Amino acid sequence: MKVIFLKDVKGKGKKGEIKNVADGYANNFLFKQGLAIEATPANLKALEAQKQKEQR
């Protein structure tokens, strides 16, 4: 369960940072609450697209 922490945690996770936490922790704490989400293309993309500004 790669994990996109949407916010930082106890000095471990970081804003929308994608890394796998405890493959199950990911969905049993960060996802079911408000720390991260199941790293998935559906979302992972937005994390980068959200960083699009004026370069085209």
Q: How far apart are CA 8 and CA 51, in angstroms?
A: 18
| Contacts with 21 (C-beta within 8 Å, 6 or more apart), sequence order | 1, 3, 5, 13, 29, 30, 36
Say which CATH number the domain at 48 has: 3.40.5.10
Residues 14, 47 contacting (CB under 8 angstroms):
no
What number of other Cβ atoms are within 10 A of residue 37's Cβ?
22
SS3 42: helix
Q: Which of 4, 56, 10 has the alpha carbon at shortest distance from 30?
A: 4
Range of the domain at 4: 1-56
* Contact assessment for residue 49 and residue 16, using Cβ atoms and an 8 Å cutoff: no
In the numeric block, which tokens belong to residue 44?
């992972």
Q: How many domains does the chain have?
A: 1
Q: How was this structure determined?
A: NMR
Please tell me the number of Cα atoms within 13 Å of 13 on its side-chain side.
26
Total Cβ atoms within 10 A of residue 45: 10
Distance CA(21)–CA(19), nearest Å, equals 6
- Give the Cα separation of 3 and 20 in Å (integer): 5
